[PDB]
Design an enzyme around this catalytic site. Sequence first.
Site, short mmCIF file in Angstrom:
data_model
loop_
_atom_site.label_atom_id
_atom_site.label_comp_id
_atom_site.label_asym_id
_atom_site.label_seq_id
_atom_site.Cartn_x
_atom_site.Cartn_y
_atom_site.Cartn_z
N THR A 188 0.87 -1.21 0.00
CA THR A 188 0.00 0.00 0.00
C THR A 188 0.89 1.23 0.00
O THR A 188 1.91 1.26 0.69
CB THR A 188 -1.00 0.06 1.24
OG1 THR A 188 -1.53 -1.25 1.53
CG2 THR A 188 -2.19 1.03 0.98
N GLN A 189 0.49 2.21 -0.82
CA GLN A 189 1.02 3.58 -0.92
C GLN A 189 0.67 4.16 -2.29
O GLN A 189 0.22 3.44 -3.18
CB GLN A 189 2.52 3.71 -0.60
CG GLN A 189 3.53 3.35 -1.68
CD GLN A 189 4.94 3.73 -1.23
OE1 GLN A 189 5.57 2.99 -0.47
NE2 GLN A 189 5.44 4.90 -1.68
N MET B 209 6.08 -5.49 -0.26
CA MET B 209 4.80 -4.82 -0.45
C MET B 209 4.85 -3.34 -0.09
O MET B 209 3.84 -2.75 0.30
CB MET B 209 3.69 -5.54 0.33
CG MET B 209 3.26 -6.84 -0.31
SD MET B 209 2.67 -6.58 -1.99
CE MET B 209 0.92 -6.23 -1.72
#
Lengths: 212, 222, 204, 233, 196, 196, 222, 198, 198
Positions: free
Chosen positions: D1-2, D107
């Site tokens: 996530t980002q 990730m």
Amino acid sequence: TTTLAFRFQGGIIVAVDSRATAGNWVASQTVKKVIEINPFLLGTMAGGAADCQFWETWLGSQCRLHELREKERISVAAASKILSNLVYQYKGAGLSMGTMICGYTRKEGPTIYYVDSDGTRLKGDIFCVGSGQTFAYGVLDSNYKWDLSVEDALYLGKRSILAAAHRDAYSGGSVNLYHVTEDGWIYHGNHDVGELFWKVKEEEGSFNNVIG
Amino acid sequence: QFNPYGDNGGTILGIAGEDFAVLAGDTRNITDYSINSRYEPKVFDCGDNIVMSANGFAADGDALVKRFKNSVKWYHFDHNDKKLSINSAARNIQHLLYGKRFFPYYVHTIIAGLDEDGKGAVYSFDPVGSYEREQCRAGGAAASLIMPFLDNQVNFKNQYEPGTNGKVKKPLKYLSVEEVIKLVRDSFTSATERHIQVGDGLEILIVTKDGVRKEFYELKRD
Amino acid sequence: SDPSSINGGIVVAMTGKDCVAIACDLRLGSQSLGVSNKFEKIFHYGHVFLGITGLATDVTTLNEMFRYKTNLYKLKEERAIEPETFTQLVSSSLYERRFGPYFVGPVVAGINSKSGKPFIAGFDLIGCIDEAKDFIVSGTASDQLFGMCESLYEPNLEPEDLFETISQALLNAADRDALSGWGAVVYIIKKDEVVKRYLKMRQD
Amino acid sequence: TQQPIVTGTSVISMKYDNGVIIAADNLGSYGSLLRFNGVERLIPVGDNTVVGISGDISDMQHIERLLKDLVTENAYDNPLADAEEALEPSYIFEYLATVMYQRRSKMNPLWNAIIVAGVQSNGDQFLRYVNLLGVTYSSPTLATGFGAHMANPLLRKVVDRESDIPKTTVQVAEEAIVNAMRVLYYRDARSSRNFSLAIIDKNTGLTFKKNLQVENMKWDFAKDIKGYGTQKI
Amino acid sequence: TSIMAVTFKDGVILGADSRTTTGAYIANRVTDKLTRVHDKIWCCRSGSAADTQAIADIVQYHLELYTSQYGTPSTETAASVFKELCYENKDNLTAGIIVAGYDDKNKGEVYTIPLGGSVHKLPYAIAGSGSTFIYGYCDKNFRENMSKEETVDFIKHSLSQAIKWDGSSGGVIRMVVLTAAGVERLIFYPDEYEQL
Amino acid sequence: TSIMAVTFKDGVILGADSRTTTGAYIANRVTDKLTRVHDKIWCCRSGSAADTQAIADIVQYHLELYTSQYGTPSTETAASVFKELCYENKDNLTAGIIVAGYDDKNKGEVYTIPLGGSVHKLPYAIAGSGSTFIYGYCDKNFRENMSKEETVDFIKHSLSQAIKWDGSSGGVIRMVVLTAAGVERLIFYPDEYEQL
Amino acid sequence: TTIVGVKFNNGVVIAADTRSTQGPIVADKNCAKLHRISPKIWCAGAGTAADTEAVTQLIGSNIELHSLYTSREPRVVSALQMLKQHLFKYQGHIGAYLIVAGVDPTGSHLFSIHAHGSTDVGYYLSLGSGSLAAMAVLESHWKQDLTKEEAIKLASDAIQAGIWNDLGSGSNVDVCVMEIGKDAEYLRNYLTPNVREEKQKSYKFPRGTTAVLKESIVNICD
Amino acid sequence: MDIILGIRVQDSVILASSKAVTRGISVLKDSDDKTRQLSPHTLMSFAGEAGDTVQFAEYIQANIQLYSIREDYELSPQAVSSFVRQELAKSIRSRRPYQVNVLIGGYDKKKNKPELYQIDYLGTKVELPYGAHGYSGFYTFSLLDHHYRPDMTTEEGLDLLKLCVQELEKRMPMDFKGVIVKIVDKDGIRQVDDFQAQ
Amino acid sequence: MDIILGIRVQDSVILASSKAVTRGISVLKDSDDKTRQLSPHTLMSFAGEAGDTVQFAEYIQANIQLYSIREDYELSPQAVSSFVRQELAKSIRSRRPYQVNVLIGGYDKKKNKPELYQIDYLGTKVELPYGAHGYSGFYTFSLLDHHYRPDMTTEEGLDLLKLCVQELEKRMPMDFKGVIVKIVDKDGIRQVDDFQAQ
Ligand SMILES: Cc1ccccc1CNC(=O)[C@H](CCc1ccccc1)NC(=O)[C@@H](NC(=O)c1ccc(OCc2ccccc2)cc1)[C@@H](C)O
Ligand SMILES: [Mg+2]
Ligand SMILES: [Mg+2]
Ligand SMILES: [Mg+2]
Ligand SMILES: [Mg+2]
């Protein structure tokens, strides 16, 4: 996939198909769905190839280790429970395997254990496992007698996979046959459905759904 | 959200002879509708007379090849320079792949070499390490285009003896390295014509009891 | 569960020297369950042949619709519909249902009775015409079929030779698809006569 | 996530007969706001390598720090740091490729597309790409983002295969690069008129050109365009 | 998009950039966003190109039919027709229109119709994604009754700032001058306006 | 929020509005958005009040420890500490910080740290939701080496436009002047700045 | 797909690639993408092929009726207006993206139309996946007052940029030249630079290869 | 899940339909007859969605009966099934489709043949020597593939079903409370009303 | 759904447990003993999610057996049931909770009284004259409210149980292939090997 194992007067019949799929793609027709753990032990494979292949090969190692440690071959009950317990450690992580551990020991007699990736482990005389199980079950159940000859039982096995290979889209290729005795597995060969279907139609007068 | 996987095209194909094996793959690398490179090899001589391709997501492909090339190296260090037989390589690669069972390498992988008896051998793997020895195998984007052709032209499936009423099969035989490379180049020109991800160039690696030989052929660039 | 996959099914058509061929498998499944071994997917209105893959109910509904339409055509025009014209009738009929389409992959095969030239066409489910002059493929093994044809095909084949190519194309494609197979019929269409053969294949 | 925040568009590049050319505009966007205007996206490492970065600028600034730290570290206990044991383009690349791949595998990626350009110690040209997935490839021409769609087709008209690279002079290559930058400025809404360009040559060495501008733009034909169909005045 | 309309002593001027984007790609760099719905009634379009073009066509139609039956419509009348279409169909429209026109009685007039379909008469108006960046500038520099050369300057400066900061704005700056004189078209190129 | 820092001849000035909202309710009309992390290093905060306060408090801690060991930290050092925290924690922070400082050597310096965690050295910086409306005005009116009184005017005018358009900005304009002199707190009330 | 339109001093030209695709597979290797609206108004489509075809034929039909009714040559702005109004009505769901070009009594015209129904007027335009490869070429080489020869070369080179660099585009270049003087000249397969090379081998089967279960003659007449 | 089986022998067609009707946690009926007579020589069996099942069957029955009286003539099994198919095919694309699967078994007096038609709710029709709807097919199809012969007597056909039912009573999860069996032949439709305790 | 019934009569506790194991569309087994003996005078039956069921049972069995050997003593039924509840209570807030419901039937030699404990997977324990897990309780609780007496003999208890199994066979939509019945009293645990047609 379709796999079956049943107990009778003269031991155990293990029979499996040989088709591998990814979706609707036929990946392979010549796949090995039986593992020969040791001279007296067999395992069948249904579900995820890798899951089965990798964990049943591993089971082989674990069994071999028992032999060295205990100076004696592992019981079917215990071999099945090793795999049962491993699989259970992974519950909910998405392992997908339908499995039968079949074999002979003096203390147990001939024995079949069904083990899946839900952790279910059951002892019984008849199991069919795989997307084709119901099809095999239909033929198997309706012609099963305890006292079938070795020759008859091998054929009923052979015939049940054929039944399944014909109806289930995800079964097919070839039939692999095994007999397990007090002495104990013997391989009764590979049987390509390409020829077997037509031969069995001719000789038996079955399969009237098929034109020509 | 961040997707850790991509798709770089790319088709690979392995055929086992009697005393040889070929591993071929196109040299085009793609992302969506763009071409990244027209010549980016994805077939590799890994030492010990084994060749390897891991096709699909190139980052995972490269990571796996790298990691296996290292297995070979550390096998030499720990086992007194023993050659790594093709079957041992296969079993090893299963553990690499299954090792990442819950975050897989998104590759269809193929290895080619010679077995213990000097026979041509081909092994193929799914993303999570399921593997089988085979006579021939196509993997990757155009696998569905090429596999049935090989079933027909390598294992002679559905081919019967003329006149025998279709009751006697055409006999399976080994093919020459010339007859194999013909099927390969044909398989790939077919694949280029019908699949947008396949093209640019073909590279074939041939494995014999003298090592690894390379052959290159231009493919259609559209 | 995608409607084009429920029943399964392949059609292929090829052109050759003064002839055309159209072949189909015979399976009618419901997902994994093989249900019928005799479900043919090739129809004929006069000298014009139509093969249809996809949702089987639509396959049946389309055949009945094109029978209906070509009958009325024959009565008003006092001649048999031609392949080129029929293609157009197929195309616009499918597009009439642009926003609730029939889930089908139709194929047309025939020889022009006036000009004698072989003609094939494919369509997607909303009537877009594929105007290839070599081969047309359709169904759940279309990928495999494209692979076979592009390898096996060559222009100007003789009918007896074309029979081999189309049959080998179909048979080997069928055998890489879980949902197709279970029987095959090939039509060889020569201006003057039509031979239809049933093939021997794997029943798995 | 980002998710990327301040971003900077294409990096385009090609090989020529003696070395490599790489260019990038000096803009740092913030969504559709053309927020920052003197952002350098070409990073010289030693004097045989230039790293061009597009994507998230904060990650770019991190990779800048990584590269400087690598020059420092290579120098340590190394009396041949500016001779035989100088950082090669191929070393710099392999390092970044490693970092990018580990980051996606954790990730938590560095939200970038990077082209490493330079000349090896043996005179060989180096040109290779890596991005947030750790995907790597190499080609006579390489571009990121929009550049991939618009610069490549133009640049490939010049160097279409390996055998075109003896044939391509520095002047021809730079002209192609400069023209490709204009085309991107015409059609990429997240781009800028000012750019940097660097040439790494096996003879010349590193030539870093700052404050370049797009010239010779065609706009005159706009006066004839009335309405969107039927309007005449 | 950067669009603006400004009333001044002699009439009104409409101005706009020339960039159309889909995503970050420039589909058209020489777009003409200045739209004629009548001899001296013009508008500027922002939001969906489909929607605003369809709306401008129906308005053009209504005003043509109006003229044939009842003489020239007033600029307010044209705004009302725009508003009727924008409000009544607000749910299926994404339309931000600025209407500007020159009348003999009322001289220069400007009406803005934002997303909902409300109407606002203003001394000047600004819209499009570009306009956020020039609210401060424009409010600080607009005066009533400017001269033609002053109004051109004010539009030129404002739009160049809008173009400088907004990615969705760019290209040439187009103006239409609407006075008693007549209708005058103007264009200004990047080399000209980037210098300011 | 409207926040800005401007470097001029004799140093640097920070300015901010005084409004904090939760939705359309004004939780605080007299907030001090000008935050001291060292004697002559100050910052303006935007985004999450919790995040930025916690960040400012950690930076103040690091610079106090810094001064104890190594002496006066440079503005660049202060910006680097801010960036470190903001970058290393970009995936828990909604923090947009402007850093402004004065030392004798480097004079007046400004660093802006937007959402990502990147650092940008600039002659002046604007940020906060009200900043969007003043990109045109600021780019058109900023000059280098302005006098104190000129700079104060530039911020005063810029922020009043930002306040005028952005509903999240408002209240009083606070300023902090940073020079060799000295630290100077300024304040300007609506009755003064609205009439600009 | 790559489609372009280029205006020159006495008319307008349009070009297209000849690849049609279904996802990654090439269905038709030489399809016609250049549709005729009326004798001197021609059209090129992208997006849903059935939609571009149909919308072209519908407006083409109505333009003919309009022409007969008015005893006048069809006008491009009429095609444009009818098309955009139809497309708009369908709020997008008819996925037609068109470059419409032609000559009429008022001169020569070049427009594009998007699926939702917005139109743009231009001197040079491109649509389809190869859109950006083609635009890179046009922006690089377009000039005011091109000759017919120059505009054909530019149009052709742009499609080519699409063929080589876009995976959704390939095969051949179709062109149509509409000049103010004479007829529209439809130039099919103007370029054919993607000839399939000669197969390495023939795959003609020995007769009787295929097993047959049963055979019968099918009746045609009545 | 609802067992609907059909087997075509040489001189007759035999339909077997489960007797349970189960809503939720309760078996509400153990003697339901999942069948309607369409004509003296045509019988239809049905399973599927709770309401639609009987409404569709009765709607079909009324139409065939209407046709009968209008022409003083009995439509062939083939003609009846095409009607039924067309009805389902229209239904599938309407606002709320009938979710009903059917087997049509009839004796064609003109041809002197028995005929079995399988049709699902989508309107997919096929003629078969034996058929099933739902889960039951996953067992019976392969069982009949083995034991079935084309030239069997009615009495032999009833043994084949006894096997089919037995197998389903062994391996199906749900208690379907036995089957009602009906034979359609040259004479018509009769009920073998002693199959469960046989 | 797995039938799990228990009834406490005057001098014993009777456990009855369905014999089927069903996965999907298949009954894999019709003789499954869903019971573990925890000690000579304590019996536990179980139903729930596929794997956790046996794994939980055998884990409890190992523990109670460990206790017995350590202390050379048999834990009271009440202590075993408390141990079981706590294990389930801890389990419900763990990473992956055991999805098993249990019946504990015990004869307490120190009090000479039979005891029945119903505990669900949440660790909800309650002592009952009679109990059930799953849907079966929706039938059997009301029947036993009517037919049950606190002074019934073991034999009367078996009749009452037969009455419960008849109701389930009639009204439950699933085929559970009859029960295995077990009696716990002072002379230990014994199985009634004939019940399926007794
Ligand atoms: C018992 C056994 C043992 C040996 C051989 C066959 C079988 C029977 N069995 C199969 O044929 C199954 C049926 C499908 C099935 C799969 C799994 C569970 C149940 C059914 N097929 C496979 O396992 C195949 N691989 C795959 O299906 C896959 C494997 C990995 C994939 O990776 C995708 C991916 C990668 C990265 C991230 C996310 C997804 C995709 C497909 C393999 C024959 O290549
Ligand atoms: Mg070895
Ligand atoms: Mg290709
Ligand atoms: Mg099968
Ligand atoms: Mg305010």
